């Protein structure tokens, strides 16, 4: 019965494939040469940078590194606003709450720990230590000051109540390590890529997987939603990025090049969604034209692999962290 | 500047000095990756152990601070986080000789880390544990592990030396040494072995940087 249902889904997906996105996008002007330059270089991290996240004001950003430090930067002046020492130096993710009042981070300690930035005292303190995951924390993201989704290497994602400090919902169905997480604009759904080479759309309130997406040949390292919320992009160890549509329930576009033979670490869209930016193991970030699947530009100012990247909410700038212990801001 | 911007820049400079001080303090540590099968003597490998995600013990030996990280316990995809320990000075790989069915799992695990892309150039300090229990056990079960190849004498020093050669057969690259040591859990001084191997590794890297190697 499982084989018949899987075949039925394949037949159902094929029926909705009257045309490819390449054909419908054949008669628009190419984006052209996208040349960005390093406008700021943030220095002060002394080890590999694994994650970063912009604040909603598009000026403040948090970065996490293997030196056991979590730094909040003022990108405009390059001022260091806070330097938060971490109990565990094996952080792999960090988050900045939409209000700006909190940041979160976690990693091989299997805990996404919450920090309060705005206290009557002048110092930052730990608010909560969300324990309950069996594997390493790979990604957590705030919905509000009281709710945070986590993804973990134990093949599950969890929605936490920060006040009580326990899982409100546990999202299960992945057969491999979950590596990345991306909340929809409305925060009613989120997508998630894992080491089983598939992506799953989950409903936050009901607790279950709506859709499952396949096509990748290796681990999915990174995932990001399109600004519409009706599609998402994935980045994988098979040197490929793929665009998935939720309503069509299948692949649309593939971003690859024969000279690219290295994994993808991070992905992010532009404000309009026309540019798909991806970090790579070959020490550069490639700017893909999302609609036409053409390479539009390269950011080649890192001496080690680009581990993370993020575009501002106003779309004015993009950040890139790397294993060379530097962050750069590009325009 | 606005005189609040000046105070913010002063605060940023103080944060920078604190970051530099913490970096200077952290730079004098020897980071070591502990590996091996379960019940292979990983935990009780050194007497000094001051400290289910990741366990980090540490000890001081001859004014050198050692940090040993036991990654056994994650039980997840190893390739997704083993790159975190890319900058360790060396790897400590423990093997239980008295376990004749985990000998092949240990040998296969040794290949994976020896031929890792992130550890091609990382030296390994090999510990062959439980030699006291190996000598008393070899008299009964002589040939229950390396069935095809072993056609040598059944002495304690003969099969033990043969097991050692099998592990160092897997070092398929230059600039990496394997420092094999035979240990017994009764009474030993394993900090000297790690300290001596680390000094040799650091001297080798220093000569490589200077160009003499």
């Amino acid at each position, epitope marked *: 019965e499982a084989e018949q249902l899987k075949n039925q889904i394949r037949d159902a997906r094929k029926a909705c494939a009257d045309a490819t996105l390449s054909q419908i996008t054949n008669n628009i002007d190419p984006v052209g040469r996208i040349q960005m330059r390093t406008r700021r270089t943030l220095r002060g991290h002394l080890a590999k940078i694994y994650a970063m996240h912009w604040g909603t004001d598009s000026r403040l950003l948090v970065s996490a590194s293997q030196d056991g430090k979590l730094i909040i930067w*003022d990108s405009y002046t390059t001022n260091k606003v*806070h330097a938060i020492p971490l109990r565990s130096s094996w952080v792999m993710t960090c988050a900045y709450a939409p209000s700006g009042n909190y940041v979160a981070c976690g990693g091989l300690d299997n805990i996404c720990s919450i920090y309060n930035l705005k206290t*009557r*005292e002048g110092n930052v303190r730990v608010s909560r230590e969300l324990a309950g995951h069996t594997g390493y924390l790979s990604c957590c993201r705030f919905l509000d000051d009281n709710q945070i989704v986590t993804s973990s290497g134990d093949t599950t994602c969890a929605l936490w109540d920060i006040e009580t400090g326990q899982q409100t919902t546990t999202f299960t169905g992945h057969t491999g390590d979950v590596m990345s997480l991306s909340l929809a604009p409305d925060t009613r759904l989120f997508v998630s890529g894992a080491c089983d080479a598939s992506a799953k759309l989950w409903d936050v309130r009901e607790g279950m997987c709506r859709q499952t997406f396949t096509g990748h040949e290796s681990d999915i390292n990174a995932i990001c939603f399109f600004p519409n919320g009706n599609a998402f992009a994935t980045g994988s160890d098979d040197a490929t990025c793929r665009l998935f549509d939720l309503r069509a329930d299948q692949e649309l576009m593939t971003y690859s090049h024969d000279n690219i033979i290295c994994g993808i670490t991070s992905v992010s869209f532009s404000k309009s969604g026309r540019l798909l930016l991806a970090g790579y193991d070959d020490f550069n970030c490639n700017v893909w034209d999302a609609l036409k699947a053409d390479r539009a530009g390269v950011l080649a100012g890192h001496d080690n692999r680009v581990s993370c990247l993020g575009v501002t909410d106003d779309g004015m700038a993009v950040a890139t962290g790397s294993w060379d212990s530097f962050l750069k801001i590009w325009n | 500047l606005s*005189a609040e911007d000046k*105070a*913010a820049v*002063e*605060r940023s400079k103080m944060i920078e000095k604190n970051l530099k001080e913490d970096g200077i303090s952290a730079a004098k540590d020897v980071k070591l990756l502990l590996l091996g099968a379960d019940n292979s003597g990983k935990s009780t490998i050194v007497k000094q152990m001051k400290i289910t995600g990741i366990v980090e013990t540490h000890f001081t030996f001859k004014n050198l601070h050692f940090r040993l990280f036991d990654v056994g316990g994650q039980r997840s995809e190893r390739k997704k986080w083993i790159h975190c320990f890319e900058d360790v000075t060396a790897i400590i790989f423990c093997v239980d000789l008295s376990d004749y069915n985990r000998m092949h799992e240990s040998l296969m695990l040794f290949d994976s880390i020896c031929n890792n892309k992130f550890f091609i150039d990382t030296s390994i300090i090999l510990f062959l544990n439980k030699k006291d229990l190996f000598g008393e056990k070899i008299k009964k079960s002589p040939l229950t592990i390396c069935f095809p190849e072993y056609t040598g004498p059944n002495t304690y020093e003969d099969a033990a030396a043969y097991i050692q050669a099998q592990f160092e057969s897997k070092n398929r690259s230059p600039n990496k040494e394997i420092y094999c040591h035979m240990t017994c859990a009764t009474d030993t001084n394993n900090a000297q072995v790690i300290f001596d191997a680390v000094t040799d590794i650091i001297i080798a890297n220093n000569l490589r940087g200077c160009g003499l190697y």
Partner: single-chain antibody
Amino acid sequence: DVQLVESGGGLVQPGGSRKLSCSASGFAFSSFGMHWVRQAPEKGLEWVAYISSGSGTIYYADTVKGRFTISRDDPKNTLFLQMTSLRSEDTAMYYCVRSIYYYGSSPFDFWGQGTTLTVSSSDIVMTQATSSVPVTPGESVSISCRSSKSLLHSNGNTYLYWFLQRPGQSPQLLIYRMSNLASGVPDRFSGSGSGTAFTLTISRLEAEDVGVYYCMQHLEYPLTFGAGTKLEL
């Protein structure tokens, strides 16, 4: 809780010397810059001295330069003010104020209860035109303040601060940088202004809104207050 307790003073002869202290408690004292502000009897506030976090920057008002000395003891969580050659003009209630400076911070957010000193016998001008305004509970009020120089800096910030000193109490921050409500302040208070003309609006007056309202600039040192406008019921 945050606490700043000043001590030392009460009566000194002219030409004498006295040392003021301020014991900090309940906050990371080393992270904050500290100020001394004094209030003469039946007069407004006047900034005295400032010492930054780490003691890298020190400033003094012109009326006290050379005579007064501000120092700091971070392990002891204590701030000091050594005064020499005291004059009749130094009779005032001396206040201890914490200030932290980063992007989005709140300087001047907490004041001590003050210590009284009695001596027995270019600069931006802040103009608060009205001196007293009779008010009714439930009515809306609009206090105004003027500045000689434009407080709008090129970085987009307008460095104007509002303080409310209730009868018998130390002043409390209301607005910082001309628009931002301070923590713990009700939403009735609002701040508006442009360059030189500024106003603080109260929507529905309460019995606890009775007191003197001061405007302060922080564009450049020395920090200057305006003669506050009293509100009476």
